[PDB]
Assembly symmetry: none
Homo-oligomer: 78 residues x 2
């Protein structure tokens, strides 16, 4: 749901960031727990997307990006 | 390493299972930390196995699961 998506985004942000970093990580973990209480597969996909976003941010291949986009489209479809 | 992978699997199992649940989660986190102390790609790939194990434990679409697996393989490749 929207809340779950927000939690995933927060977790991704915490991962990108890395104390303050520790606090952020704890918050992300709490959000994930709240989201928790297939679904697991969806969560894994979201985590992968967050990791990809973090990598992109760090950077600033094309084929890899296209593959990721295709995977996201497939996930959206089902 | 193998020990790290085992710790990750244990953490995943604890997460799937779920106070007692909180204690289990804490134990899983501790195990993960112990396990902790390209490579990142390998870890991500392993994470997929842990997620699959957690899903199996929860159990006791297919196309979507296959697509997710393909995406994970692509990520591992690059």
């Amino acid at each position: 749901y929207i809340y779950l998506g927000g939690a995933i985004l927060a977790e991704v942000i915490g991962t990108t960031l890395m104390v303050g970093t520790i606090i952020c990580y704890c918050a992300s973990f709490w959000l994930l727990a709240q989201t928790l209480a297939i679904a697991y597969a969806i969560w894994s996909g979201v985590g992968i997307v967050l990791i990809s976003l973090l990598s992109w941010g760090f950077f600033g291949a094309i084929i890899g990006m296209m593959l990721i986009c295709a995977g996201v489209l497939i996930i959206n479809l089902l």
